[PDB]
């Protein structure tokens, strides 16, 4: 889709809630910005940063109803 490959080339194409400010810093180590103020507009670098070093929770109730997919993986091996 040409629409998708026209807004990933511009900064801040993703929307999130205001709680992102208290958890993700405005700038990273190299000095690249991660979000801007006028919901707020965020950058994919924020997603990568969260996946890199963010809060960790190890609850097991999240994959609760996902156990039907794991049966396929078990049967495939």
């Amino acid at each position: 889709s040409l629409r998708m490959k026209w807004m990933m080339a511009m900064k801040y194409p993703i929307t999130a809630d205001k709680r992102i400010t208290e958890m993700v810093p405005e700038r990273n180590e190299q000095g690249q910005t991660l979000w801007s103020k006028m919901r707020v507009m965020v950058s994919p670098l924020a997603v990568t940063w969260w996946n890199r070093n963010g809060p960790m929770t190890s609850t097991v109730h999240y994959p609760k109803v996902y156990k039907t997919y794991f049966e396929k993986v078990e049967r495939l091996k």
Binding site: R27, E29, Q30, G31, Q32, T33
Partner: protein, 97 residues
């Protein structure tokens, strides 16, 4: 001395194209891009005269202003820093009798 001699290292751009004759600013930027491993800065030896947070803020401002070139319609030839509190203190612009 003006520049330190024995305790210096270099960040090489290695080979440039033989026909490449350009502005020093972009050569410096290309040299900077080839390095990964920045961290959060902190002080290991104070100056025992002056304010060290000003030094930290100056380094951070230099890095941020070097990264913020992309927010410009036209590419500049030289970079002019913002006149900030820590830079004003460092350059001594407010101790003039």
């Amino acid at each position: 001395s003006k520049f330190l001699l024995m305790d210096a290292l270099k960040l090489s751009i290695e080979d440039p194209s033989h026909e490449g004759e350009g502005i020093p600013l972009y050569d410096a930027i290309k040299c900077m891009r080839t390095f990964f491993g920045w961290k959060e800065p902190y002080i290991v030896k104070p100056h025992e005269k002056g304010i060290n947070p000003n030094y930290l803020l100056s380094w951070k401002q230099v890095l941020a202003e070097l990264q913020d070139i992309e927010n410009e319609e036209k590419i500049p030839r030289t970079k002019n820093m913002k006149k900030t509190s820590q830079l004003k203190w460092a350059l001594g612009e407010n101790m003039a009798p």
